[model samples]
Target: PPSPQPVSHKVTSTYTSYRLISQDIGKSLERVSKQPDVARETEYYREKIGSVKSIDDFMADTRLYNYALKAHGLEDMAYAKAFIRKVLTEGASDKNAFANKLSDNRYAELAKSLDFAGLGAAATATEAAKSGVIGNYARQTLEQEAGDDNNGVRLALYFERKAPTIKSGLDFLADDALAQVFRTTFNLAADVDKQAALIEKSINIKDLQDPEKVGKLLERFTIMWEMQNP
Candidate 1:
């Protein structure tokens, strides 16, 4: 068989763009959720409240996975496995463990939907724990602060602890140069049927093994970035 043709570079670029776009949308939804007026406008709030679900759905969408395919980019399956492992190991004791948990739950759900086990058995257990912890914490916090003036402060502090973890995870996935290549490749592959077909041909069936390939991919991506931005 022919040596695996790496995913086209354009795919990776698009995926990175989409990831950044989704991240921005997620932040916007978070801001909207905090507005008092949002709470009062039930219908509007209900519609807006679905943003989180939408983002989660998008991340897991197979089409989206194939869309990301920058040249020399890694496979989505590899990306998912590595991403999950990164989250589990690095994010386990994250300061923003709560938010990290939320992120992990979404990933786990996506993995199940994709009929893939990115993190193996731990995915289900971790997701369940996340649900329980977050739900119970929210309930207790709300009840405790029912008549408290510093409720907002308390909640803010609580979330603050987990913010670093979320930020770190985001940075790792979105900002890291090689990760950018991976994102772009996935997005590109997802955009067209031919590209997606190409990905299947090119992907390493086992774990990610070519550090030189990854390095070259990042080098190519950096050149692209500089050309566009400079």
Candidate 2:
């Protein structure tokens, strides 16, 4: 319904991070939501209510992106890259198709716009290696899991701690079956936020075992998720 306020560059970067993380989760959700039974469920859900108006609406109110970001720990570049590769190889044909569709110029533009770690160099290499469609080449490049474990444990920890609370916040919004879908979608956004916090935590914190940090992240995550869902 309402457009999000114009974000500052810093906020833009955060949003970009959220978008990429959400894209990963959205791709998975798209697949899951497409399953015959799941599709019927979603359609039933929609019929009882209505479709979400925009990605932001889903993200803000449902916290779908936030949950995805948390669930996957996508703030950590190396882990994120690896996780994305795993998903791409395992469960993302449509995503692969979409990636393959970008023209060289478009690919270049996306590369320039995205704030992925070390992806600028990778993008340069990708542009040079654009043999098939841009998406195919992009997929092949992403398939390569580069570097070490890269704070994966930290990322996992943050998400693990935050998910339940976020889910709880979402459950508060469910007034009916129709409202429940909104809650589900909002939880997905919370999933993304957890993913981002995990990524950020992984990069910033040496110890993944901090209960206090975990609690604080969960608290903030819950607050943000609730605000969006409401």
Candidate 3:
């Protein structure tokens, strides 16, 4: 118990609160990862995930399935078991798969993680299903808990965690959270390619991978978000 809380600071503006967490994300997330509820759920996922032998097994176990979905930021679709089943069964290897066809990249990410089609019954034992999902679950929990105070702070943490995984401009726009940060920072719009183009003009694809660069972008986003919200 390095710290009792995820964030150790007084109430303030969104940017200040975000800065407190961003200054030491590792420590901040460590505190979040060690919380009672988070620890219990993580342990459950660790113990139960290996038992998932097939997509049906995965779908049958709502706890395991919901944990995986939340890890991929698809908690809203938790009730859509059949829909998620298609995403997992189709997988992400094929260009025309259901997940790949979706506008949101999270579906493709989730499908790839628990790819029953690609890894068969052994899918749940894969690194993505175990370590990757666990890692994301912790991060997602951190963002969610932070939101209980200020949504902008949560968004900042979210963008920081996800920025490194962004592979392309399309990947950037595909995620609503990232898209929101990008749009808020630059005051931009949609049309996929068009939005991607607008984003690329202001930021290089490689910039998203750099912590300092992403921090600067999020700083701008925080400022804009506060102005709009206030």
Candidate 4:
């Protein structure tokens, strides 16, 4: 089988020993150049780096692993550190832990989503959103759940994020027209599709202050919502 490919030239911002890494990659390739079968021998000692309890052992094993990386042109420190960090971060000391968790390549997706800044932002927006900080609206909506669901946490965050836009939209309604729509009915789930029909029909009618609009919507919206819960 082919050797595992290199990921980068140490693309990470920190955790570098690149000069050592590059040198190891070179020396690594040189050995395999004369004795290709020796490449497979490298794997025998793959996990030996972490097992090292002595300076001599560290050089023998870590240097061997670094050579495999150089074979593939992946010299990125970010790549090296990112991969290594995930390995070292785990307390389990299992060689397969990172690979097992990311078996479907989910780690790559995570790498794409997080930038250098967010790489370690220490942000807990998810936890914060799961709290009562959103509003009566979000809290009331979210409180229905017995416990935190990922979706529920994100919804609270969304509500908190969009609250200003929601408030501004409300404040601009000149007539109490839109206000009456929400006065009692925030639960339009059952008849929401029908609700849009009501809006469209109102516009196609003799229409608002012009009569075809808001009041008609307010009346129907209030009525349907009342019917749903009542």
Candidate 5:
């Protein structure tokens, strides 16, 4: 069978394309995950990540490190081992850790899950290092592939997947993609507190938990995105 393309609609408008992909996301993600290269990489990661007993061990294997980074949507930072080493070493235990300081909270999520500082050699043995990362890798790969076809579709899909996981309105601001969607939807650039308030007013925290609400939010986002891009 042929691989499932992220943008498979003939119309290819943001809304139509997004609806198509979002509705059949499971099969879409599975198709991307099962691509020969992706499948092999996932297999290797699951098999070898267990041997990563320390930061050094994790860093030494470039393939493993690359796959792990890609899983967290940090594939672009695969070469910055020195920076990532610091993030891992610092972990997220302290509020002021290196990862936490980054604007993109993906790094913070990565550090917290693979807590080399707190867990030390046993960090990679955690479930977050195993199935957790594997799941992220699948979704990130899907998003990356979708971006290649239409960036709007990518952002919409990413927002839906991450919405339920948001800790707060501020957390929404921390992620680059989610922030783009929100800012575009509302057409605002204000003080941090103001931004949080706007987000809270516009989207109930419980709304993020509902597929219908999240879909409505993305619908608004896509409309704004198309208006701006057009």
Candidate 6:
């Protein structure tokens, strides 16, 4: 007879929210957020987890954050703290474990660099993933950039600043494509003109409820930017 698999096995997973895996790594979402606004956000989501039987359901629901960001003027300090928790949790549970071992053996110094690198970078990705609602975050990001040289370096450097406001809003959007499209162009493009063109043309504004359509457009935009920049 063929060998039977065990009744249970350790399957690889992507359930990496600090709020989800915090216990495994000895952290807690309650203590994660210091600001009253963010502390409330953390506890609100924990209450959400209590209502759900699965982590998938909890993550898929980002409606609350959207509610807060728009109604509350979008605090950067709170989002940065929240974003940091995410990176620490994800780094601890990454699929690449041997890479962690190498960091231990060869590049322990790499941790601090990667820590902030991944932390800052996550703001864009998190925004792309969750900034689903119709909000002014994108416009705000650009408007603040008006004082800069408004070119390749200044434009690329903007992600390092004003990133927390780039977050998800689940009231209208339910996926990461629109924000991804923005980040993709903003990160990869050499000229601000291309960024402007993308922001103008990347999505059929009327069809934003369908992220797949947005994603396909972004995929094309990604290629276009790559070809233009490369």
- Give the top-scoring candidate (lDDT): 3
In model 6, pairs of residues that clash are 130-168, 130-169, 131-167, 131-168, 131-169, 132-169, 133-169
Which candidate number maximizes TM-score? 3
lDDT of 6 at 5: 16
User: In angstroms, how far off is 178's CA in candidate 3?
Assistant: 1.0
- TM-scores for every candidate against the unseen true structure: 0.23, 0.18, 0.88, 0.19, 0.86, 0.21
Q: For candidate 1, lDDT tens digit of each residue in 1-230?
A: 21122122322342243234233544534544354643343233233322323324434543333322110122333345335333333333334432244422333323332221333334333433333332323333332342154322222222222223222323323212323343443433233324324433454422233534433443444344434433
Give the CA lDDT, 0 to 100, for residue 217 in model 1.
41
Candidate 1: 10-residue stretch with minimal lDDT: 66-75
lDDT of 2 by residue, 1-230 (tens): 21121121211232233334334744644554455743453344334212323222323333322222222223222233333333322221343432223321122222232212223223223332232222222221222111022122222222432233222322222112212322332354333323434333333333324655544543444344434433
Find the 10 residues in a row with the least total lDDT in model 6: 10-19
Candidate 3 matches the true fold with a TM-score of: 0.88
As for candidate 5, its clashing pairs are none
Model 5 TM-score is 0.86
**Candidate-wise lDDT, in order:** 0.33, 0.30, 0.82, 0.31, 0.81, 0.32
Query: Which segments of candidate 3 are over 4 A away from where they belong?
Result: 1-12, 188-193
**What ranges in model 5 sit over 4 Å off?**
1-12, 188-194
What residue pairs are clashing in model 3? none
User: How many steric clashes between backbone atoms does each model show?
Assistant: 35, 30, 0, 21, 0, 7
- Candidate with the larger lDDT of 1 and 2: 1
